[PDB]
Nucleic acid binder design. Structure first.
Ligand SMILES: [K+]
Ligand SMILES: [Mg+2]
Ligand SMILES: [Mg+2]
Ligand SMILES: [Mg+2]
Ligand SMILES: [Mg+2]
Ligand SMILES: [Mg+2]
Ligand SMILES: [Mg+2]
Ligand SMILES: [Mg+2]
Ligand SMILES: [Mg+2]
Ligand SMILES: [Mg+2]
Ligand SMILES: [Mg+2]
Ligand SMILES: [Mg+2]
Ligand SMILES: [Mg+2]
Ligand SMILES: [Mg+2]
Ligand SMILES: [Mg+2]
Ligand SMILES: [Mg+2]
Ligand SMILES: [Mg+2]
Ligand SMILES: [Mg+2]
Ligand SMILES: [Mg+2]
Ligand SMILES: [Mg+2]
Ligand SMILES: [Mg+2]
Ligand SMILES: [Mg+2]
Ligand SMILES: [Mg+2]
Ligand SMILES: [Mg+2]
Lengths: 201, 101, 53, 303
RNA sequence: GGACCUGGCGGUGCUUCAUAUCCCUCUAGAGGAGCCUGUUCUGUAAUCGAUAAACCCCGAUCAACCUCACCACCUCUUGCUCAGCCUAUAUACCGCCAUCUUCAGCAAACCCUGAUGAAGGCUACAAAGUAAGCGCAAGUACCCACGUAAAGACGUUAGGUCAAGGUGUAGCCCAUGAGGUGGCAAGAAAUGGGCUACAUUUUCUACCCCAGAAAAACGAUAGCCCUUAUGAAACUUAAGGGUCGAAGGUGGAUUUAGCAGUAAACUGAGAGUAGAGUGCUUAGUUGAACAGGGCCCUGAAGCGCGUACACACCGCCCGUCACCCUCCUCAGAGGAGACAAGUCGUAACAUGGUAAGUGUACUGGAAAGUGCACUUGGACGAACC
């Protein structure tokens, strides 16, 4: 890394800086004073202060990226979000007044809830042994499972936006091959339950 | 007293090519055009073939001038990579230096 | 049938227990650092003398 | 030795006078800087290592501090700690211990000189352990709530260790602006940010929405103004070259942020720096190395 | 033969580590297809060298003739050279290098300990080490003081190169030298690397990123024909065009690289040629994911332990079965020793992979296995944990 170890990662959060001094604790005051003497890495070209920045969606776009085609990855992500929103609006209009209360229409909420539903609780590690999964690994496994399922060859000629929107809605409703894969992981963990003692941590 | 018989042959080839270059250029000018009659071009072809074999420029090989290495010869200095490295490392070539970037 | 609908409570307990185990690992690791190094340093100042001065 | 060093010093003075005469300058006012400049002109040397280039410094600088004899004609050393082999260091430790004893009986931008500095002061080789012991003793002395004499004695060993804002200028109409420059990858940009406007940014005379079709690059342009809550409060004219679309966007972002520092308050400037808007991203392409595919991709290990 | 020292080794103990590295984890590949190319095997009249890591787009930043050292035929003999030889010897060397090395050690000269043995020299609240010098480091180039370069000692593998050139030794001297004409270079078959793909995050077009069409087509840089570039000579090389629309549908074990402007993808330039690479060097653009657990698996370090090894485990070595000798007992046959290779195993030497051995008994191709008791000529890491 061209950055010397002294450089510190940038904190991009307007609220953190607009916070009044009075609300700050002594530890927080000391941290703010110290940061005035430290070097700060240049803000990456990916994340900004836009209120429409969703780190989960940014990470999903990065994962979907192929060969540094960030433009195409972003295009696919926005197309998927638009397709999800349009399907939700169509269902909302086609639905009765009662079901319109239930029918969600926010693509960001749909995406977050779908990935959360696809997050696996217990993993398997060679030691195979059932084991707890850290939160970062859970999120990455959810995202990778979603992307791999969308990239599966079983879908013929269907475009990635449509495929991913359909899979995302299925996951949001707790259905689809992604949830099936999570259930399969859980079932294998249950089957190897007896081997849980092999784990030394 | 050239380095080896191969370098001597290349020297002979260079001398012959320099001797016959003008005649070769003249005869090949007739062949390398689409204006003159095909019969004239064919007689020119047989003449250029009749010229001695060693006069062909393609037979000139760029051998190192100090060790007769037939390959790895830097044209600007006419020295095989080994001899060029020797002289440059000992610092006997102006400007050249070990590169680091 | 491996459906989270009712398992929510047990799954939450599992996650809390895993977090507690990780936190305990960290706390033990930090708290571990009389240690053998210090004890050996103390001993070297008073070496056993199986010979004669 | 004294005779050699004196001969060198006299020779250096005589050569200094000759150099002043050769350069046609006053021999008396000729300084070390003048000597260095004259020598550099007279013997141009492009060798990168400055120590390798010709030098005519004073013999005091040229020669090392070769230590004097420690025992007289009778063979009796001068320092009672002579046989310790580190008389200077151990005498210093003895003095520090005595000062600590006296303190006990009676009762921020400065670091500690590195082991190299301590060795230079003590004209004695030292080990890291010895230096650490000495530094710990000095720390105890300072913490002991000592007097002014002890503090000034410690000062012998103590060693003293924000963004800059461009100046606002005025255009033909007198309206205020600021100018800045930045670089990213191979891209280089220069930005002029005016004090008032409708958020209109013209890159190479083209509006940003047309120069950067990519929403990512447009967000990069937006980032500084959005950070400082000034969306639409300024107009900007930027000229960029080199690099690709993303490199140009980053360079323009950096230049615009640096210019905006001329207007935003100091608190906002510091917040921008902490957010990273005012740090030139050193990350550039890494040269391909011979025998490997790229900067780090080695060839497929054959078996 | 007994006891030790040093080193190598240990399917050796504990502890701490590996930061693209040992495992899991992340990305992209190879292993499945075609093509290009190197190597091996076959073939030929037809090089040579490298060839485990550290060979295999390697000597070559380059083979139609030449290059060429190879083969066939022909020709010359003081020959370009006060000759010549690409003849053997890299196990004589210089020269330039691989290698651990992604190491920090090597150290002359002193001093001390061991009863003045090989050898060893460590405790910082310090207990015999001091050390010039080399290396690291530092300094330097690139864009910082970062990172990448560069650098990286002494030694190991008698590691590579007698074919860069020189050189010792040995060898040919009407040829193992010199010259000319012509000629190989293909693929039964395998294998390494690279390229192109298998597509929808795709393909064609416009633009160079707000579009329209294709979509069982995608997919050859392959094959065949034609033209053009260079050249005396093109089926041989390259480019273009036409024609064809092939194999294949993300690929088993296993395996490679990568910690950030990196991987991945994409676009140029240069060296070298008359021409010639999907090869090499280099410039630039877009530009990721994990980065946390560990030591059950591989290596590193520290402290240890064992050692019948010292060409240092790719070691050493046991017994049978077959083979020649010398001696002994024996109605002819056995035993021993020696010479000596194979054979089957791996019994012992490290916890020798079931610790070893003594007595005794049963069993078995063969070292030997097991049973009962006994020895340490094994260990149990030596506070609590
Ligand atoms: K493959
Ligand atoms: Mg040529
Ligand atoms: Mg690896
Ligand atoms: Mg293949
Ligand atoms: Mg071969
Ligand atoms: Mg060979
Ligand atoms: Mg020929
Ligand atoms: Mg030939
Ligand atoms: Mg010959
Ligand atoms: Mg050798
Ligand atoms: Mg090397
Ligand atoms: Mg290097
Ligand atoms: Mg260095
Ligand atoms: Mg050898
Ligand atoms: Mg060899
Ligand atoms: Mg001959
Ligand atoms: Mg074709
Ligand atoms: Mg032609
Ligand atoms: Mg087609
Ligand atoms: Mg055994
Ligand atoms: Mg055993
Ligand atoms: Mg037994
Ligand atoms: Mg039995
Ligand atoms: Mg007894």
């Amino acid at each position: 890394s061209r950055y010397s170890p002294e450089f510190k990662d940038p904190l991009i959060d307007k609220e953190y800086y607009r916070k009044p001094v009075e609300e700050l604790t002594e530890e927080e005051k000391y941290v703010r004073e110290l940061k005035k003497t430290q070097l700060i890495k240049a803000a990456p070209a990916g994340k900004t202060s836009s209120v429409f920045e969703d780190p989960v969606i940014s990470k999903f776009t990065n994962m979907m990226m192929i060969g540094g085609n960030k433009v195409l990855a972003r295009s696919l992500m926005i197309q998927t979000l638009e397709a999800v929103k349009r399907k939700q609006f169509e269902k909302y209009h086609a639905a009765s007044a009662e079901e319109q209360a239930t029918i969600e229409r926010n693509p960001y909420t749909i995406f977050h809830q779908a990935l959360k539903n696809c997050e696996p609780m217990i993993g398997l590690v060679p030691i195979q042994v059932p084991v707890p999964l850290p939160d970062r690994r859970r999120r990455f496994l959810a995202m990778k499972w979603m992307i791999t399922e969308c990239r599966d060859k079983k879908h013929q000629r269907t475009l990635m936006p449509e495929k991913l929107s359909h899979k995302l809605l299925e996951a949001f409703h707790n259905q689809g091959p992604v949830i099936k894969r999570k259930h399969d992981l859980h079932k294998m963990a249950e089957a190897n339950r007896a081997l849980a003692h092999y784990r030394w941590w | 007293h050239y380095v080896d018989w191969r370098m001597w042959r290349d020297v002979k080839r260079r001398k012959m090519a320099y001797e016959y270059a003008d005649e070769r250029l003249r005869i090949n000018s007739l062949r390398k055009n689409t204006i003159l009659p095909k019969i004239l071009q064919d007689v020119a072809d047989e003449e250029i073939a009749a010229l001695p074999r060693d006069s062909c420029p393609v037979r000139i090989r760029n051998r190192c001038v100090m060790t007769s290495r037939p390959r790895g010869v830097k044209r600007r200095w006419r020295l095989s990579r080994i001899v060029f490295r020797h002289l440059a490392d000992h610092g006997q070539l102006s400007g050249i230096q070990r590169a680091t970037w | 049938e491996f459906r989270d609908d009712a398992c929510r409570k047990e799954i939450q307990g599992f996650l809390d227990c895993a977090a507690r185990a990780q936190e305990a690992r960290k706390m033990r690791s930090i708290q571990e650092t009389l240690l053998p190094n210090k004890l050996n340093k103390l001993l070297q100042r008073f070496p056993n003398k199986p010979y004669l001065s | 030795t004294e005779d050699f060093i004196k001969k060198q010093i006299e020779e250096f003075n005589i050569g200094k006078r000759h150099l002043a005469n050769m350069m046609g300058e006053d021999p008396e006012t000729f300084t070390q800087e003048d000597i260095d400049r004259a020598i550099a002109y007279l013997f141009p040397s492009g060798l990168f290592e400055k120590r390798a280039r010709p030098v005519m410094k004073h013999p005091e600088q040229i020669f090392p501090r070769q230590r004097a004899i420690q025992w007289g004609e009778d063979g009796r050393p001068f320092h009672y700690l002579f046989y310790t082999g580190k008389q200077s260091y151990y005498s210093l430790m003895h003095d520090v211990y005595g000062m600590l004893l006296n303190l006990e009986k009676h009762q921020i931008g400065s670091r500690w000189l590195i082991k190299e500095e301590l060795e230079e002061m003590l004209v004695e080789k030292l080990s890291d352990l010895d230096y650490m012991q000495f530094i710990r003793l000095l720390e105890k002395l300072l913490t002991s709530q000592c007097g002014a004499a002890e503090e000034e004695f410690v000062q012998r060993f103590r060693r003293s260790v924000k963004q800059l804002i461009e100046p606002v200028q005025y255009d033909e109409q007198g309206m205020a602006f600021s100018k800045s420059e930045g670089k990213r990858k191979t891209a280089k940009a220069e930005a002029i940010v005016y004090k008032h406007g409708s958020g209109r940014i013209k890159v190479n005379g083209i509006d940003y929405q047309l120069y950067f079709p990519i929403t990512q690059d447009r967000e990069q342009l937006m980032f500084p103004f959005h950070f400082v809550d000034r969306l639409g409060k300024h107009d900007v004219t930027c000229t960029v070259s080199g690099g690709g679309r993303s490199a140009q966007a980053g360079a323009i972002r950096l230049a615009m942020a640096k210019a905006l520092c001329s207007f935003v308050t100091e608190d906002e400037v510091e917040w921008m720096r902490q957010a990273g808007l005012l740090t030139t991203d050193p990350r550039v392409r890494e040269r391909k190395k011979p025998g490997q595919e790229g900067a780090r991709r080695k060839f497929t290990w054959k078996k």
